C-alpha cells in the first residue's frame, strides 16, 4: 500500500543521486513498479501525476548505471509500452497527465529505440484534434501547448493515408497561424537592372533583414512544425509563395540555431526533389554562405548535419552536369576548399582517436571523394600529398584483419550482432579509390601499386566467404558487407580497362 | 590582340564547325613511366570531313615550325564493328 | 513617435544606427526635421522628396499579409552627412561617373585613381563597411584590373602608374593579393561583390567576397584617418554601395552583434561616497594608485551603495512608504546593519521634516558622459595601444536603459 | 603627478553632462526609465512588500486579486523563501520546495553540486562546532551523494579535495558570502527557467502586467550558443596543410521504431579536440540579472578606465 505522501517523499529523496535509483532497481523492494504500472482509470489525478513523475525519475539513469542494472530496465520500458493504456484515453485525460505521459514516452524512446510502439495512431489522432479544436481557436492553456511541443518532438523521432492528409493540413495551419504574426518584418531594398511591386527580387545576392521571433514557444512550435511539414507535404502551396520564401530567407539570419537550421533545410529541399530546379544557381549562391557559417556552431541539433547536405549538393551537381559544378567553383574562389582540405589533413594526423573522430574523418573522406569525382584539378591536388594512399592501404588492411579475425572465431560465437565498427570508414576510403581511379594518368603513374589491387581482391574474397559462411549474424551485420562488395567491384571495373597497367 | 578576342567572343558552337583547333602535350612515357625531350607542345588543326591532322611543334630552346601532317590509317576490312567502355 | 523612426531608418544605414555614432545622426535629422514632418505612406513621401528613384530603379519590397492569410489558413548634402557617400570627380576629366556618383564609374597603360567624398574620423564610430560590384571586364574572365580599399590621409602619379603606393591598404584583383604584403585570397572577375571594412575596436581592415568573410588583411591601424579609394585601368567598371540606397550582401550586422556581445561579456562578467577627496587648491590631482573606484559585487560594497542611493532617491521623490517597505524587506533579508541604521535614520529625518509642515540620475548621466568622453579622446584598451577598445561597442541608451 | 590628456573642471563637465542628458531625454536632467528600472530591481531580487508598493504606485496593482496574480506570475514569495532557506542553512528544505513548486526539471538539468557542497560544509561545521558514527555518516554522504559529479570534472574533483582537506581540522569556503552567492545564482536560474511562462501568460492571456525582464523591441534566446570562428570558413588563406604522420588510425584508438541518437554530436567533440570566444551572452544571459547592478558595473569600469588613461573627471557626490 503506497499513498500520495509516500510517493512524494520517495520522489524528493531520489533527486540528484543516481545510486539510490539503482538500489531501487536492484533490490526486491521493486514491487512498487507494479503499482507504478497499474494506472487505473479510477485513480486520482494527483496519484496518476505522482506515479508518472516517479516513473520518469526512476528511468532517468546514466548509461553506466543502466549497464549496471541490466535487462530489468529494458523490461520496465517494454512493459510501459505494453501495459499502460493512457494512449487510448488521450482525449479523455486532462492536459497534465497527457503532458507527463508524452514526456515519459520521449524518455522511453530515447533510451530504447528498437522495440516497437503499438499506439502511434491514437497519438496522431489526439494531436490532430488538439491542434484543430483548442490551439487554432486561441483556446489553449500552457499544458496543452507544451503537450503539442512534446508530441512534435516525439513525431520527429519516428524512423519510417487519410491521417497523412490530416497531419499535413494541421501542420500547414500551424505554420500559417504562427508565421502571420511576424510577416511584417520583411524589408529588402534592392535594384533591378533593366516600385512597390515584387518583380525582379530573384536577381540580387541580398536577402531581407533578420527576422526574430520573440516568443520562445512560438519559435519552438514553428521550427518543429515546419520540419514535420517538410517530411509530409510532397506526398500531398507554401513553397511557391514569394512572401513565404522571403520570410524564410529573412529567417536565415536569426539568432536561434534551430530556426537557422530549419530554414536551411526548408530552402534546400526542392533541389533534390523538383525537376529542372538545379538551374536556379542564384538561390544557391544566396544560400551557401549561411551553410558555411552553419558549420561553425557548437550546440547543433540532431536532425541537422552540414556535411551530409554539402555532400548531397556536390553529388547532385556531379551527377547532373559532370562538366560544370557551381558549388565547387563558388567554394574555390572564397577560400573554403583549402580550409576543408587542411581540416582533413589535421583530422588524419590526430594522435588520439575515438568513435567521434572516426565519424568526423569519415565525413571528411566522403566530401573529399565528392570533390574529385568529376574534376582532374582536385584529383591531382589530392594526389599531390604522398601520405594519403598509405592511409588508404592501412584502412583496407585493418578491415581485412578484422574480417579474418571474425571468420577465425565463428565456431566459438555460434541472432542480432553489431556490425564491424569501421564499415563506413572503409566505404569512404573505397569511394576515394574509385574517384582517383577514374583518371588515366593516375592509373599509369600514381596508382601503379600492386598492393591496392591485392587488397581489393582480398576484400572481395573475404566478404564473399563471410556471406557464404557466417550467415547467422543477421542482416544488420551483412548489409555493409554487400555494400563494400559493390564499391570494391566498381573500383575493380575501373582498374581493369585495357590501357591501364594493372 | 584585343580585336581578335573581341571577334572570338561572338563565334558559334565549335563542334558544328568543320575545323577544330587544339593543343597537344606529351605527358610521360607509355611502356614504363619511370624507366625529357617533349617539353614543347603542338598546335593542331583537325579537319572533320576528311579527318586529317596538321600542326606545329613549339619549344623555346629548340628549332621552330616543325610540321606534322597526319592522315587516318586505312584498315583491311571495310566492315567495322564497335567495342565500348565506360569509367565507373 | 514612429514616423521619426521610420524616416531615420529610411534615410541612414541600419548598422550605423546601432553604434554610438547614432546620436549625431539623430541630431542631424532633428535639426532639419521640418522637411519631413502604414510605412507605405512614409516611403511614398520619401520617394516624392526623392530617396527611391534614379536612372536601374530603386525598388522596395512590400509584403502582402492579408492575401497570405486569405489564401492560406541632394538630401544628404542638405542634412550635413559627414561620412562617405559618393566618389569624387577628378578635375583632369579622366573618369566617367553617373549623376549620383555611385551607380557607374569607368575610366576614360596607367591606372585612373580616385577617392571618396569624405574621410573617416577615428574617434567617432566603431565599424565601417562598403561594397563594390564589377560590372564589366575588358584576359581571363576571373581577372580584373581593379584595386579597391582604403588610403591614409595626411605619390598620385605612382598610384596612376603602379596601382598603389605605401599609404594604400587595399585588395588587388589582377593577382588576388593585398597591396603591401602572402597567400590571402584569389582574384575576382565579373559579377563579384567585393566588400571592404574597417574595425575600430581592434583596428583592423578586412575584406569580403560574395558574402564570405575573408579574414583580417591589415592589423594595428588605430588613431588614423582613412578614405575609400579605387584604381581602375580603362576597360572595366564598378558599381559602389555605401549602404544609403540598397541593402548589403555581407550581414555586417551579425559581425557587429558578435563584437558587441563580446564587449558586454568582458565588461559585465564605507557605503557613502562623500566629497571628492582629490580637490586641493581648486584643482584635480592624480592619486598614485591603480584604481579610484573599488566597489565589487563579491565584497557586498556595491549592493550596499546601490541600496543607499535607491533609498535616497525614493525619499527625494516623495515615496516614503515605498522606502519604508524597502527597509522592511532589507531587514527581512538580514556591514548591512550600518546600511539598515542609515536608511532608518533617513526615513526618520524625512518624517520629522514632513511633520514640521538625487544620486541615481547623476550616476546614469555620468555613465553616458564618461562613455562619450572615452570615445572622443581615443583612450587605450587596457595598457598597450594594441588592445581592443570595448567602449566603442556600447550604445548606452539603446542596449542598457531600454 | 597630474592628469595629462585633459583635466575637466566643474563647469565644462556639467556642460557635457547636460548635453548628453538632453540627448538621452530625446532618446527616452531626469530619466524617464528609472521607475521601471527600480521595479525590475525590486521584483528580480525577490522583495515582497517593496515590489507590490512600486507596482501599485506605477499603476498596475488595483485589487487584492491583482496582488495574488502578480505574486503568482513572478513567484516572488517562493523565490524569496528559497533564497532565505539557502542563506540560513536549510538546504534540504530548499531543494524540497524547488522540486515541489517549480518541478523537478530545474535540478535534473550546475547548481546541484554547489547546493550539495554547501550542505556538506554546513553539516561539517555543525558537527565540529556542536563521534565515529557521525564521521562515518558524513564520509558516506560525501562519497555517495557527489561521487559522480566530482569524478566527472577536474575542477569538481579539485573542489571536493579542497573541502575534504579543510574538513580534517579543529577562508572563502568558511565565509558566509558563499551562501548568498549561491542563492543569487539559484534565483537567476529560477527566473530564467520561468521566463517563457511569463511570456505566454502576458501575450496569450492579455494580462495588463508588463514584462520586466525583456522589452518587446530587443531579442532574446532560450539557449546558449558558442560561435567558433576559424574552424570552417574562408579566413584561413589559399594554402593547404599536409599530413604529418605515418601511423595508422587503428593503432591510435505495425510496430514503429525510433531513430538512434548514439554519436550524433561527433562534430562538436571533434572540433573541441581540433578577439576570440564569440557567443551570445547579451541575448541569453545578460537580461536575467538586476539592471541597476549592471549600470554600477559600467560606472565603476568607466571610472577606472578614465583614471587609467590620464583623464581627470569629477566624481559623483
Author numbering:
A (entry chain 5): 4 to 163, 186 to 219, 234 to 275, 280 to 457, 466 to 553
B (entry chain 4): 269 to 303, 310 to 362
C (entry chain 1): 16 to 52, 80 to 97, 109 to 126, 326 to 360, 393 to 422, 425 to 440, 496 to 522, 527 to 614, ...
D (entry chain 8): 27 to 54, 84 to 164, 192 to 212, 219 to 258, 275 to 357, 383 to 403, 412 to 454
Show me the paper's own sentences about this structure.
To gain insights into potential functions of Gid12, we obtained cryo-EM reconstructions for Gid12 bound to the substrate-receptor and scaffolding (SRS) module (a Gid12-Gid4-Gid5-Gid1-Gid8 complex, referred to as Gid12-SRS), to GIDSR4 (referred to as Gid12-GIDSR4), and to Chelator-GIDSR4 (referred to as Gid12-Chelator-GIDSR4) at 3.3, 9.8, and 19.4 Å resolution, respectively. Thus, we built coordinates for Gid12-SRS, and generated atomic models of Gid12-GIDSR4 and Gid12-Chelator-GIDSR4 by docking them with Gid12-SRS and the respective prior structures of GIDSR4 and Chelator-GIDSR4. In agreement with the biochemical data, Gid12 primarily contacts Gid4, and also Gid5. Gid12 emanates from and extends this groove, to wrap ≈305° around Gid4. Three insertions (Ins4, Ins4-5 and Ins5-6) form helical structures that pack either against the sides of the propeller or between blades, while an insertion in the third blade of Gid12 (Ins3) forms a meandering loop that plugs the central pore on the bottom face of the propeller. Gid12’s interactions with Gid4 and Gid5 bury more than 2400 Å2 of surface area. The Gid12-Gid5 interaction primarily involves the edges of blades 1 and 7 on the side of the Gid12 propeller binding a ≈ 30-residue Gid5 region that was disordered in prior structures and is presumably stabilized in the complex. Gid12 interacts across a diagonal around all eight strands in the Gid4 β-barrel, from the N-terminal tip of strand 4 at one edge of the cylinder, nearly the entire length of strands 1 and 8 at the center of the interaction, to the N-terminal tip of strand 5 at the other edge of the cylinder. Gid12 extracts Gid4’s L2-loop, such that Leu172 and surrounding residues faces outside the central cylinder, and bind a pocket at the junction between Gid12’s blades 7 and 1.
In yeast, the evolutionarily conserved GID E3 ligase mediates glucose-induced degradation of fructose-1,6-bisphosphatase (Fbp1), malate dehydrogenase (Mdh2), and other gluconeogenic enzymes. “GID” is a collection of E3 ligase complexes; a core scaffold, RING-type catalytic core, and a supramolecular assembly module together with interchangeable substrate receptors select targets for ubiquitylation. Here, we structurally and biochemically characterize Gid12 as a modulator of the GID E3 ligase complex. Our collection of cryo-EM reconstructions shows that Gid12 forms an extensive interface sealing the substrate receptor Gid4 onto the scaffold, and remodeling the degron binding site.
